[PDB]
Unconditional design. Structure first.
Lengths: 36, 44
């Protein structure tokens, strides 16, 4: 069990920013085009 | 022999390294350039 839903939890600005961060960081790591 | 020896020498100076460069007063953020990670946006 990991509970990625995080249902018994709440936040407005913290979760919005986290969604933004997730997308921006994930795309940046792909662009690095590491051969590793 | 009066001219007991005649020593020859070669001399060569070095070369000068030059490059072509652009400049312009009115323009874009990058003024001139010599003739895609984008990690630049992330801090903001």
């Amino acid at each position: 069990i990991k509970d990625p839903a995080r249902d018994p939890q709440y936040a407005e600005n913290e979760v919005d920013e986290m969604r933004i961060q997730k997308d921006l960081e994930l795309e940046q790591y792909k662009r690095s085009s590491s051969k590793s | 022999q009066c001219n007991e020896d005649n020593v020859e020498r070669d001399i060569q100076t070095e070369e000068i390294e030059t490059r072509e460069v652009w400049t312009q007063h009115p323009g874009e953020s990058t003024v001139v350039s010599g003739g895609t990670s984008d990690a630049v946006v992330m801090p903001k």
